């Protein structure tokens, strides 16, 4: 395109529980980093490298319009799998998505946005090196990138699903009796066949 090939190649992010991807810089805006220098500091650790700086130019232009964290959060919330009825609820939904659904291994606490920005910037930084050819692409066949799910972890995968059903079942059983006005028997609320 006329302007499509002028900006170059832009980076997007496919966050969980969002129907459509979002520009990468928007995610940084939502995390609380507004100025371009603050965002680029988490992506490019050596500003003396002109090659890296150019790769992020199209991404910055794509998210130029969004200039505030709340604006960015609304954009993320607007594309959520369950769009909010009002703008305020959209921001809350987007905050929850980034708080827990995005890079959960980095953290789930309310004050882990800075840690998630660094790792997200590292993900972008790793992408740029692959695009620039500085680092070789990862090999799926390489067996150190693999993990083996043995009996334990496989069983632990089942137990949480089956334990969630157990906890859901007691909630349903108790709710019927509590609404009826009578206390409930814990022994009777538990369905032992769920786990067995």
């Amino acid at each position: 395109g006329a302007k499509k090939s002028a900006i170059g190649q832009r980076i997007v992010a496919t966050l969980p529980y969002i129907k459509q991807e979002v520009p990468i810089i928007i995610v940084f805006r939502a995390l609380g980093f507004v100025s371009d220098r603050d965002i680029l500091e988490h992506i490019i650790y050596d500003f003396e490298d002109p090659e890296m700086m150019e790769m992020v130019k199209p991404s910055l232009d794509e998210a130029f319009v969004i200039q505030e964290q709340n604006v960015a959060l609304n954009f993320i919330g607007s594309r959520g799998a369950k769009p909010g009825v009002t703008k305020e609820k959209r921001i809350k939904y987007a905050k929850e998505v980034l708080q827990k659904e995005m890079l959960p291994h980095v953290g789930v606490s309310d004050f882990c946005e800075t840690k998630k920005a660094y790792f997200l910037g590292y993900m972008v930084h790793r992408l740029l090196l692959a695009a620039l050819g500085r680092r070789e692409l990862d090999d799926r066949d390489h067996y150190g990138n693999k993990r083996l799910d043995l009996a334990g972890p496989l069983l632990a995968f089942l137990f949480r699903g089956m334990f969630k059903n157990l906890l859901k079942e007691v909630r349903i059983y108790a709710q019927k009796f509590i609404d009826r006005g009578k206390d409930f028997n814990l022994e009777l609320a538990i369905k032992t066949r769920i786990i067995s």
Binding site: V65, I66, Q67, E68, N70, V71, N74, F75, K87
Partner: peptide
């Protein structure tokens, strides 16, 4: 700063 409503048009 562009508002949320304004960003929709852009």
């Amino acid at each position: 700063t562009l508002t949320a409503e304004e960003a929709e048009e852009e």
